């Protein structure tokens, strides 16, 4: 597992969220994954809470369900701009990697702002063909989220 394979998976992950084909987003994770949105201060102090906290793929599907069916929020999109992954350790089938990210938010009425940046802390595994996330934790540089966070990072 090389950085450009992870880069390629990251392109599809990002493309998925950015194009609002949100139903596909859980498929990027194993059945029993961890996914968490957090910030450096929590990370630094070893605090476990997340803005999003999931320990199964089902919970990701349900989060998406709620986005579709229940939650009220104004329309907006993301634009993800990722950097090159760094691998901490890798096999032929598993990897620990971090990836730097920037996420713009563009309101439907036109305003664009830097909504989040940081790095994903990942554990990857290979099911069949391609890479799959067992863990993705989005450690955000800022402790501040503007208004609300409706789409996952």
């Amino acid at each position: 597992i090389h950085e450009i394979q992870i880069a390629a998976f990251n392109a599809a992950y990002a493309k998925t969220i950015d194009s609002d084909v949100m139903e596909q987003w859980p498929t990027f994770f194993t059945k029993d994954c961890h996914y968490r949105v957090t910030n450096v201060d929590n990370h630094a102090e070893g605090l476990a809470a997340g803005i999003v906290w999931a320990d199964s793929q089902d919970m990701l599907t349900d989060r998406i369900s709620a986005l579709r069916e229940a939650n009220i929020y104004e329309r907006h999109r993301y634009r993800h701009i990722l950097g090159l992954p760094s691998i901490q350790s890798a096999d032929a089938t598993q990897a620990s990697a971090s990836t730097p990210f920037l996420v713009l938010r563009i309101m439907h009425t036109g305003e664009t702002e830097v909504f989040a940046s940081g790095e994903y802390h990942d554990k990857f595994t290979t099911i069949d063909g391609k890479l799959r996330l067992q863990e993705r934790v989005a450690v955000c540089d800022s402790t501040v989220t503007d208004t609300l966070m409706s789409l996952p990072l």
Partner: protein, 378 residues
């Protein structure tokens, strides 16, 4: 004039109260720095001598610090020389405070302890013989601690904390904060609205099952004496462990949301415990600081329960996310209407409990306290 009240009644609120910047300056003077208690932090977050945190009361920067006698002290984060922030870290530990600018130094009470070169260097310059250290320092706050909640006031005349809270509030706080707590995360949510829209929101039982459609998809309130404070109580998921819970309060109350003028919330939603601090920033923006809590006695399964339920709250919450946005819907809907009034006529104002689904008595309650403090009564 955009801030003229329509009567002595709190059934009409002038929309200009959310945008008038002279009035916001008055809020700083008469509320934040008046007869109130501002929430600073939990005593457990500053547990050792010399541990401190920086925060705000209203727009005014504050330092809150533990001393060796086990007591907690708070003072304005302003050097009594030329005005620099004293402490620059969000949190740390120290013996003395020292201003980075010209190194004046303060004790953990906020008294001025030392002036660099007060008596010159090499007998040259320094202060005049008439200068006296004792005569200069930042404003010091009164500190009150209630069930580990650290509050601060600038006013000599504010009632004691128990008296400010009232008995009903005190026992609802005591019910949640009964044994040692442990912080399990911090997040901040910047709100695109005047602070008052958020604080009205948290008191607004009327919206509970109208704005938040999560529950239908997948009541009861009390106001303090003042009006200032309030309590809201309640007695197809691929993975429903999200809403899986466990008994821990020997009363069956599954939802307790409680507010303390002018910007503290304590919440219990099933097993999800949190404190909120609400701070004004500009006329049209404010800041909501979330402190997620666990009990120090949590088992691993209990704690994971908390972690999972937290998906209900905070900036991405299945409820909360709508609370953060709705303020901004009001801020923007009233853009052309600074001259008009909010209509808050729902429910009757009375001694005792009310059903939460069809009343606005807690919102009116905020306004009674507000007008009192602001000198805006009729």
């Amino acid at each position: 004039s955009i801030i003229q009240w329509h009567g002595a009644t709190n059934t009409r609120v002038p929309f200009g109260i959310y945008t008038d910047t002279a009035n916001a300056d008055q809020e700083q003077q008469r509320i934040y720095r008046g007869e109130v208690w501002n929430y600073l932090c939990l005593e457990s977050e500053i547990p050792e001598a010399g541990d401190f945190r920086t925060t705000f009361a209203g727009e005014t920067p504050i330092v809150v610090v533990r001393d060796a006698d086990q007591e907690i002290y708070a003072f304005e984060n302003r050097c009594a020389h030329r005005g620099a922030l004293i402490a620059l870290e969000k949190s740390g530990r120290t013996d003395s405070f020292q201003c980075v600018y010209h190194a004046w130094s303060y004790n953990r009470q906020g008294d001025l302890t030392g002036v660099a070169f007060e008596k010159g260097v090499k007998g040259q310059g320094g202060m005049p013989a008439s200068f006296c250290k004792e005569e200069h320092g930042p404003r010091k706050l009164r500190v009150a601690v209630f069930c580990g909640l650290v509050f601060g006031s600038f006013s000599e005349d504010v009632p004691s904390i128990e008296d400010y809270l009232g008995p009903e509030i005190c026992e609802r706080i005591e019910r949640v904060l009964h044994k040692p707590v442990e912080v399990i995360g911090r997040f901040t949510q910047k709100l695109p609205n005047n602070w008052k829209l958020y604080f009205e929101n948290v008191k607004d039982s009327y919206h509970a099952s109208l704005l938040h459609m999560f529950f239908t998809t997948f009541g009861g309130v009390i106001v303090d004496e003042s009006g200032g404070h309030h309590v809201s109580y309640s007695m197809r998921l691929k993975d429903p462990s999200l809403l899986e819970g466990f008994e821990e309060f020997e009363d069956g109350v599954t939802l307790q949301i409680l507010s303390v003028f002018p910007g503290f919330v304590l919440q219990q939603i099933q097993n999800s415990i949190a404190v909120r601090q609400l701070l004004p920033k500009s006329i049209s923006s404010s800041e909501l600081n979330w402190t997620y809590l666990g009990y120090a006695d949590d088992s691993a399964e209990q704690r994971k329960v908390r972690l999972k339920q937290a998906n209900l709250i905070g900036p991405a919450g299945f409820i909360s996310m709508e609370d953060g946005a709705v303020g901004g819907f009001v801020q923007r809907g009233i853009a052309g209407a600074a001259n008009l009034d909010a209509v808050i006529e729902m429910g009757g104002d009375h001694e005792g409990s009310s059903e939460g689904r069809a009343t606005e008595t807690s919102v009116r309650g905020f306004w009674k306290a507000y007008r009192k403090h602001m000198g805006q009564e009729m």
